[PDB]
Design an enzyme around this catalytic site. Structure first.
Site, PDB file in Angstrom:
ATOM      1  N   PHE B  25       0.835  -1.236  -0.077  1.00 52.26           N
ATOM      2  CA  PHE B  25      -0.072  -0.162   0.073  1.00 52.26           C
ATOM      3  C   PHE B  25       0.893   1.117  -0.187  1.00 52.26           C
ATOM      4  O   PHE B  25       0.579   2.099  -0.785  1.00 52.26           O
ATOM      5  CB  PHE B  25      -0.717  -0.094   1.091  1.00 52.26           C
ATOM      6  CG  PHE B  25      -2.058   0.751   0.925  1.00 52.26           C
ATOM      7  CD1 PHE B  25      -3.327  -0.131   0.294  1.00 52.26           C
ATOM      8  CD2 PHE B  25      -2.513   1.879   1.334  1.00 52.26           C
ATOM      9  CE1 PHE B  25      -4.489   0.583   0.195  1.00 52.26           C
ATOM     10  CE2 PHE B  25      -3.663   2.599   1.081  1.00 52.26           C
ATOM     11  CZ  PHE B  25      -4.606   2.012   0.423  1.00 52.26           C
ATOM     12  N   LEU B  28       2.307   1.607  -3.224  1.00 52.10           N
ATOM     13  CA  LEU B  28       1.526   2.013  -4.550  1.00 52.10           C
ATOM     14  C   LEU B  28       1.111   3.394  -4.146  1.00 52.10           C
ATOM     15  O   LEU B  28       1.195   4.259  -5.119  1.00 52.10           O
ATOM     16  CB  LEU B  28       0.102   1.100  -4.291  1.00 52.10           C
ATOM     17  CG  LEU B  28      -1.306   1.754  -4.901  1.00 52.10           C
ATOM     18  CD1 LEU B  28      -0.856   1.719  -6.341  1.00 52.10           C
ATOM     19  CD2 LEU B  28      -2.247   0.584  -4.731  1.00 52.10           C
ATOM     20  N   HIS B  29       0.971   4.014  -2.880  1.00 50.52           N
ATOM     21  CA  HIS B  29       0.996   5.519  -2.526  1.00 50.52           C
ATOM     22  C   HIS B  29       2.260   6.324  -3.321  1.00 50.52           C
ATOM     23  O   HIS B  29       1.882   7.307  -3.884  1.00 50.52           O
ATOM     24  CB  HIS B  29       1.249   5.705  -1.120  1.00 50.52           C
ATOM     25  CG  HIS B  29       1.006   7.163  -0.664  1.00 50.52           C
ATOM     26  ND1 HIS B  29       2.091   7.666  -0.260  1.00 50.52           N
ATOM     27  CD2 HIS B  29       0.032   8.065  -0.776  1.00 50.52           C
ATOM     28  CE1 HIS B  29       1.840   9.260  -0.013  1.00 50.52           C
ATOM     29  NE2 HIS B  29       0.404   9.085  -0.253  1.00 50.52           N
ATOM     30  N   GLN B  30       3.568   5.762  -3.335  1.00 49.30           N
ATOM     31  CA  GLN B  30       4.517   6.346  -3.755  1.00 49.30           C
ATOM     32  C   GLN B  30       4.542   6.266  -5.181  1.00 49.30           C
ATOM     33  O   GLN B  30       4.718   7.496  -5.882  1.00 49.30           O
ATOM     34  CB  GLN B  30       5.847   5.798  -3.194  1.00 49.30           C
ATOM     35  CG  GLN B  30       6.061   5.874  -1.924  1.00 49.30           C
ATOM     36  CD  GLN B  30       7.360   5.222  -1.532  1.00 49.30           C
ATOM     37  OE1 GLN B  30       8.187   4.909  -2.137  1.00 49.30           O
ATOM     38  NE2 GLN B  30       7.377   4.854  -0.095  1.00 49.30           N
ATOM     39  N   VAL B  33       1.798   9.207  -6.201  1.00 44.96           N
ATOM     40  CA  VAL B  33       2.005  10.584  -5.841  1.00 44.96           C
ATOM     41  C   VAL B  33       3.128  10.925  -6.980  1.00 44.96           C
ATOM     42  O   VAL B  33       3.445  11.927  -7.371  1.00 44.96           O
ATOM     43  CB  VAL B  33       2.463  10.865  -4.426  1.00 44.96           C
ATOM     44  CG1 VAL B  33       1.546  10.515  -3.677  1.00 44.96           C
ATOM     45  CG2 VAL B  33       3.883  10.114  -4.231  1.00 44.96           C
TER      46      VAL B  33
END
EC number: 3.1.-.-
Lengths: 298, 187
Positions: B25, B28-30, B33
Site C-alpha cells: 500500500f 502504491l502510494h509512492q 504521487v
C-alpha cells in the site's frame, strides 16, 4: 539391532555473526568503512525503541561474518559408537555420491539475495550484497551481487554463484577454511525505519555497543531458508530447514510425523534400517545436520 | 475505469499478509504521487468483514494505459518475490459498485485537548473538563499500517468498504487509491 543413540548433539555448521547495521549514503558504498552506526533511540508514545537512519542517509549497511566449518555428520556427543559409525558411513556415502553441491548452492543463494536483510528488503529500492572471502586477513576472492535480480523464490544458476557454491562446498567438506564477510547495502530512503532484531518499555531492540544489530540466529534462519522439498501446497516458497519443518508465522508444521517426511523418521530410516530416501529428502536431512541440534530420545 | 489488475500476495514464511499488504500500500502510494491524477482506485476482493481483514488480494482499478504505466515503474522493484501479477484485463459486467473510503476517528483525546488549547487559549484542566476520556472511539475496521514520509509518524489507515450499489457515479480518487468520491466495480 542398531537402535538410535540416546544423545546426539551436532554442532552448528555455518556460524554467522551478529549483523551490525550502519547507515550511510548510496553511490559511496565503496568507502563504507567509516559509516556511522544505526543507534537505537527511545520514543515515548509507554516508551518504545525505534531505529532509523539519519536524515542524510538512505543506505543501510548490514555486515556480518560467516564461518563455514565442515564435518557435517560428526556429532559432538553420541553414546552408541556403532550408531555413530553407521551415521558417519551414511553421511560419507551421501558426500561421495553427491557432494555439498545443492545445499551449498542454496546457502550461496541465501547469501546472494539478501534474505538476512529480513524486513529491510521488502521495500528496498536496490540491494547489493558484497561477499568477501577472507583468507590470511585481507581478501581471497570478492563477490558482488544484485540481491533483487537474484530472487528469494527461485534457485537459478549464475556464474559467480557457482564459484561461491564451490567455496561453501569446500568449507563444508573440510577441504579448506572458509570465512566470508557479507556486506549488504539496502537503499531504504532518507531516515526510513530500519528493523533490527527485537529483545525482551513495551519493545526493546537489540544493540551490541550503541549500534543496532540483527541477531545471529536470525541470519542463520535466513541462510537455512533452502527447503523446497517439503510437501508444497498454497505457493509457499522455501522454508527454513527444521525438524517437523515449521513456519511460526503461518502456524503450520509441514513435514509432520503423520507423513513420513520429518527429519527424525527420515534419519531413522536412512541410518538404522538403511531405507535411503529420495535425494531431495536426504539433502534436507544433511541440511538439518548442518543446522545442528539435539537429536535422540530421553 | 473498466480495467483492473489483481496483485495477490504470495504466502511468505517470514511475513504475515497484513505486513506485506501495508508495504504494498505504501509502495502504491509512492507510485501514485509519482503518477499524479485522481483516476486510480483500489479494492480488496478477499475482504472478510467478520474479522476485519483485508485478505490477500489488492485490485488496482484504472484505465488500461495507467496500469500499463504502473506495471513497469520501480514501485514493484523489491516486491516481485512477495507478489504475483495478473494482466490488465477488462472488468466483468454486471457488477455492483461500492465505495472504498478512509475512515478516521478521534482516537486520542489529548491531541484534541492540544488543539482546543491552541484554538481557545485554555489550560489542561479546562481541556480535561471539556474533552473527557470517553471520547476515544475505536474503529472495528480493516486497516493498513503506514509510516509517513513528510513527518515520521506511524499511523493506521482504516479502509471501510461502502454499501453495494448497482450503478456508479463519476468521482475522483485520493493518491492512496481510496475514494474521495469515486466508485470501483466489485467482483
Amino acid at each position: 539391532i542398531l537402535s538410535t543413540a540416546s544423545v546426539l548433539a551436532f554442532e552448528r555448521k555455518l556460524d554467522p555473526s551478529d549483523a551490525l547495521m550502519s547507515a550511510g549514503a548510496w553511490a559511496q558504498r565503496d568507502a563504507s568503512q567509516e559509516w556511522p552506526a544505526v543507534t537505537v533511540r527511545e520514543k515515548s508514545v509507554q516508551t518504545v525503541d525505534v531505529a532509523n537512519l539519519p536524515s542524510d542517509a538512505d543506505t543501510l549497511k548490514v555486515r556480518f561474518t560467516l564461518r563455514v566449518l565442515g564435518g557435517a555428520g560428526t556429532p559432538s556427543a553420541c553414546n552408541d559408537a556403532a550408531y555413530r559409525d553407521k551415521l558417519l558411513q551414511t553421511v560419507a556415502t551421501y558426500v561421495n555420491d553427491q557432494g555439498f553441491a545443492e545445499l551449498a548452492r542454496r546457502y550461496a543463494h541465501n547469501l546472494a539475495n539478501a534474505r538476512f536483510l529480513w524486513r529491510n528488503r521488502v521495500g528496498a529500492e536496490a540491494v547489493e550484497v558484497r561477499i568477501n572471502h577472507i583468507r590470511q586477513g585481507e581478501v581471497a576472492r570478492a563477490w558482488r551481487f544484485d540481491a533483487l535480480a537474484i530472487g528469494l523464490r527461485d534457485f537459478k544458476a549464475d556464474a559467480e554463484l557457482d564459484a561461491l557454491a564451490e567455496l561453501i562446498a569446500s568449507g563444508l567438506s573440510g577441504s579448506g577454511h572458509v570465512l566470508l564477510e557479507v556486506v549488504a547495502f539496502a537503499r531504504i530512503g532518507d531516515g526510513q525505519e530500519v528493523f533490527p532484531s527485537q529483545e525482551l518499555k513495551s519493545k526493546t531492540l537489540y544493540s551490541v555497543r550503541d549500534a543496532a544489530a540483527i541477531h545471529s540466529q536470525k541470519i542463520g534462519n535466513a541462510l537455512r531458508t533452502i527447503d523446497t522439498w517439503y510437501p508444497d501446497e498454497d505457493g509457499l516458497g522455501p522454508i527454513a530447514v527444521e525438524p517437523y519443518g515449521s513456519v511460526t508465522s503461518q502456524g503450520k508444521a509441514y513435514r509432520q510425523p503423520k507423513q513420513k517426511l520429518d527429519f527424525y523418521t527420515l534419519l531413522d530410516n536412512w541410518v538404522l534400517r538403511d531405507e535411503a530416501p529420495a535425494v531431495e529428502q536426504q539433502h534436507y536431512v544433511i541440511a538439518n545436520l548442518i543446522r545442528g541440534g539435539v537429536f535422540g530420545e530421553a | 475505469m473498466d480495467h483492473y489488475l489483481d496483485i495477490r500476495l504470495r504466502p511468505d514464511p517470514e511475513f504475515p499478509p497484513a505486513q506485506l499488504m501495508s508495504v504494498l500500500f505504501g509502495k502504491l502510494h509512492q507510485a501514485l504521487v509519482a503518477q499524479g491524477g485522481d483516476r486510480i482506485g483500489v479494492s480488496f476482493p478477499d475482504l472478510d468483514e467478520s474479522r476485519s481483514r483485508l485478505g490477500e488480494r489488492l485490485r488496482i482499478h484504472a484505465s488500461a494505459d495507467d496500469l500499463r504505466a504502473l506495471l513497469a515503474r520501480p514501485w514493484l522493484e523489491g516486491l516481485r518475490d512477495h507478489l504475483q501479477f495478473g494482466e490488465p484485463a477488462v472488468v466483468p459486467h454486471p457488477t455492483p459498485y461500492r465505495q472504498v473510503s478512509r475512515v478516521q476517528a478521534k482516537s486520542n483525546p489529548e491531541r484534541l485537548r492540544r488543539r482546543l488549547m491552541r484554538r481557545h487559549d485554555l489550560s489542561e484542566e479546562e481541556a480535561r473538563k471539556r474533552i473527557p476520556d470517553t471520547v476515544a472511539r475505536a474503529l472495528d475496521l480493516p486497516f493498513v499500517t503506514l509510516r509517513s514520509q513528510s513527518t515520521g509518524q506511524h499511523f493506521r489507515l482504516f479502509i471501510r468498504h461502502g454499501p453495494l450499489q448497482v450503478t456508479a457515479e463519476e468521482g475522483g480518487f485520493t493518491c492512496y487509491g481510496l475514494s474521495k468520491g469515486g466508485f470501483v466495480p466489485w467482483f
